[PDB]
């Protein structure tokens, strides 16, 4: 890999759709250093996008590994985002408490 | 039908690789999970992996020491356990086809279990 | 780390300055997957920024490790960039050929 | 004055940790480098590290197997060599205060060298 990002944070605003013709589940992952950053995660593939939409929840803590992508937009006719598609990337929910 | 293997007696600091071989019926298109049951405790979540392998769940007590993976060719789920502790002593059970959230012990199919004891 | 990026690519457009009151050397790092992305790298600290300005060249191949930051701008009164400051981050020049 | 240590005889696949202890005069505010000289060849670049430790240089033949680091408290530079090959057999020299680019063998101070031979 020439392009690898790992982020651990809290999930928000999960939603699902189509960017172009690809199905995508997108969510915001807040990382915190003591500095907050609100990263846009996009999970691609009909099955993976549905797995993420279905089983990842608002407020879950996750570790994401994916690629940093820069889609310029700003110009016709989320600039930065993390592309997660297996087997290159994954989302791991970390479960605890109670 | 699901069959665990790879269990064993191991010393603290050690590693092990557990494996679950699965029938087409239980594995295909299905999320797969590992649970464990320690002496005197109800069984608890360890790790789970979606059909695509892109979505993983880890118990916070195991996160960053254990890795779950699956091989959709061999119909296997693997649990690589690193940095084992006494508290990891349990029978470990593979499961397939969760009825709800991947983290709760409600699955259509269960293995018979495999012992892991860490001295 | 809750926020780690590793990029390997080609360096362009090295320049030096002040973002606010911090000295910064900034450069563009192109990563390529076979997909080109033009990442903005900012190296902070008076000494490190000067080390990078002085000894990293246009066209060098580098591996950078740093943090993904999102500075909204777009609003008064490089959105995404990689913050490299030791000891959290580094730039490694890879030298070869001839 | 610079003094290498940590060299040795090692088998292919092995590791070693070379270390260079440096005088305040040679080390302070200075970039530090490792070179090596294989039998029958001129000496070549291995790795170099800026004063802050934030800027590193690696020879492409060593990249991703060797790691260079420095300790500005102990005035040391370290070269962690992993995955050693026969071709890594050389005398290894620490250097301080490059006169130009970190990768060329033009430094104000040089160590006496330390042998690394990989069978």
Automatic annotation (TrEMBL), chains A, C:
One GO cellular component, as annotated: mitochondrial mRNA editing complex
GO molecular function: endonuclease activity; RNA binding; single-stranded DNA binding
GO biological processes: RNA modification
Keyword set, alphabetical order: DNA-binding
Protein's recorded name: MP18 RNA editing complex protein
Lineage of origin: Eukaryota, Discoba, Euglenozoa, Kinetoplastea, Metakinetoplastina
């Amino acid at each position: 890999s020439v392009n690898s990002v790992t982020l651990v944070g809290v999930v928000h605003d999960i939603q699902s759709g189509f960017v172009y013709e690809d199905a995508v589940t997108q969510f915001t992952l807040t990382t915190t250093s003591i500095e907050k950053d609100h990263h846009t995660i996009r999970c691609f593939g009909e099955l993976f996008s549905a797995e993420v939409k279905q089983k990842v929840k608002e407020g879950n803590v996750v570790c994401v590994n994916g690629r940093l992508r820069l889609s310029p937009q700003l110009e016709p006719s989320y600039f930065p985002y993390i592309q997660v598609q297996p087997p290159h990337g994954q989302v791991a929910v970390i479960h605890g408490d109670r | 039908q699901l069959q665990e293997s790879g269990g064993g007696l191991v010393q603290a600091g050690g590693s092990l690789t557990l494996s679950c071989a699965a029938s087409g019926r239980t594995f295909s298109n299905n999320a797969m999970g590992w649970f464990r049951q320690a002496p005197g405790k109800e069984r608890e979540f360890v790790a789970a992996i979606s059909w695509t392998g892109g979505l993983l769940f880890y118990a916070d007590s195991v996160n960053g020491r254990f890795t779950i993976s699956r091989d959709n060719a061999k119909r296997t789920v693997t649990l690589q356990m690193n940095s084992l502790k006494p508290e990891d002593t349990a029978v470990y059970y593979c499961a397939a086809r969760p009825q709800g959230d991947y983290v709760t012990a409600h699955y259509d199919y269960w293995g018979q279990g495999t012992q892991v004891t860490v001295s």
